[PDB]
Design a binder for this molecule. Structure first.
Ligand SMILES: Nc1ncnc2c1ncn2[C@@H]1O[C@H](COP(=O)(O)OP(=O)(O)CP(=O)(O)O)[C@@H](O)[C@H]1O
Ligand SMILES: [Mg+2]
Ligand SMILES: [Mg+2]
Length: 426
């Protein structure tokens, strides 16, 4: 929060009645197993059972929708009341603020953006970005309350499980720079351009010229300044040429367009993350970050440990540490590789989905090695070139045999502990 607040100051702004003594809080929690002194509890639904627990823990008060051991600020809707507090704390932040939305890539663009800002600051503390996936109707006001006096910029992820959700949250957020990565199918497009509602008349939009929804959006932006990204089109404001994988596989390209020309080597996989990068770069440009604040910040971004970390062993093996729907994503990642490829899975801890996976793999990867009970079914499904295994050891023995140009991908649940196998080769 930017300053602490005081129950009696809010009955007006929140359309609400104070019950019991006044108080001041500096932070809010919607979760009784994670609250402390100087804090407000928001009873959602059932939070209302746990009023002794939060009191005992030192919350100064509770925000309730129905009416006890601490002061109550009573409202009609506590999801709505939270939304208000967010907007309200957002309106005391006077620094630059970007937000983003799309079907996929919004978190990566968030990370790339934060990285660019933080590098440029350079100071990680000073740029506030959505922790995790708190990007929905509770997530975004909670993230907005994180805003505080040490922050000088902010990056906000906006997801939607429906129509209106983003128009609700984007009102709360009211960003200087909006981003749409990509998009029934017409509901999805309508939903994502709801973000253009929260922009000011001169606020910049950032839009994927390749998307089929490009026009709907261009319309909905209504003359606002507009920055575009493409991996195809020479007219776009932000472009990439000479895409070429490095030896670990991560995507290189020459950035181009209005910000200047430069080489960027990312530490991530897939053509799609080049689009993501162009969008983070467009948004950074908009916030007047110079060409190398951008490049430095993109090149400084490591992936999260255990999620698609591509590395290269001293033996010339290419190895992707990724340790269930994702199994299929992973399979497709691997399927984009040119040599022999090899999928390596421990259990996901009905038995059917392991057969489903096995068959799905077949045709897209040279081989599938696996470990644990359930995975016997997958190896079978996948057919001839599959090898099932009795323990990690015989597996790792088999794997130490593979020639370079071969790409290997490991996956499995945390209780399957396949990190044990990444270590064994790295
Ligand atoms: N531009 C893009 N086009 C297609 N797929 C993409 C994409 N960017 C990311 N993805 C896919 O989506 C997955 C997760 O990326 P990311 O977490 O940024 O998406 P997201 O945050 O938009 C989904 P969520 O709503 O669950 O947070 C990645 O594994 C990747 O394969
Ligand atoms: Mg996300
Ligand atoms: Mg995500």
């Amino acid at each position: 929060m930017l300053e602490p607040l005081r129950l009696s100051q809010l009955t007006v702004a929140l359309d609400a009645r104070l019950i019991g003594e006044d108080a001041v809080f500096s932070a809010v929690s919607t979760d009784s197993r994670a609250i402390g002194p100087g804090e407000l509890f928001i009873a959602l639904s059932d939070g209302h059972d746990y009023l002794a627990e939060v009191a005992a823990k030192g919350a100064v008060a509770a925000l309730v929708e129905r009416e006890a051991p601490l002061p109550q600020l009573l409202v009609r809707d506590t999801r709505a009341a939270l939304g208000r507090l967010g907007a309200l704390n957002r309106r005391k932040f006077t620094g630059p603020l970007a937000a983003m939305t799309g079907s996929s890539g919004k978190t990566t663009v968030k990370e790339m953006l934060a990285s660019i800002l933080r590098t440029q600051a350079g100071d990680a503390e000073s740029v506030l970005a959505t922790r995790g996936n708190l990007n929905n109707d509770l997530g975004v006001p909670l993230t907005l309350l994180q805003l505080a006096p040490q922050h000088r910029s902010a990056v906000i992820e906006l997801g939607a499980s429906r129509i209106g959700e983003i128009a609700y949250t984007v009102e709360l957020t009211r960003p200087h720079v909006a981003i749409i990565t990509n998009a029934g199918p017409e509901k999805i497009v309508e939903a994502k351009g709801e973000i253009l509602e929260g922009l000011a008349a001169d606020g910049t939009a950032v839009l994927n010229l390749d998307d089929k929804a490009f026009d709907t959006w261009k319309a909905r932006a209504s003359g606002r300044p507009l920055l575009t990204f493409s991996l195809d089109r020479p007219q776009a404001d932000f472009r990439a040429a000479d895409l070429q994988r490095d030896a670990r596989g991560c995507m290189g390209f020459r950035l181009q367009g209005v910000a200047g020309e430069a080489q960027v080597q990312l530490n991530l996989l897939g053509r799609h993350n080049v689009a993501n990068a162009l969008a983070a770069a467009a948004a950074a440009h908009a916030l007047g970050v110079p060409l190398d604040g951008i490049v430095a910040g993109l090149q400084a971004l490591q992936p999260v440990k255990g999620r698609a970390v591509a590395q290269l062993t001293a033996s010339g093996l290419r190895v992707i540490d990724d340790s269930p729907a994702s199994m299929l994503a992973a399979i497709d990642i691997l399927s984009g590789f040119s040599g022999r490829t090899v999928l390596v899975l421990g259990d996901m801890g009905a038995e059917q989905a392991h057969r489903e996976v096995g068959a799905y793999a077949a045709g897209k990867v040279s081989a599938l090695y696996a470990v644990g009970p359930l995975m016997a079914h997958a190896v079978q499904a996948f057919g001839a070139t599959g090898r099932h295994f009795a323990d990690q050891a015989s597996l790792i023995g088999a794997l130490a045999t593979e020639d370079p140009t071969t790409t290997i991908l490991i996956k499995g649940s945390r209780s399957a502990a396949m990190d044990k196998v990444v270590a064994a080769l790295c």
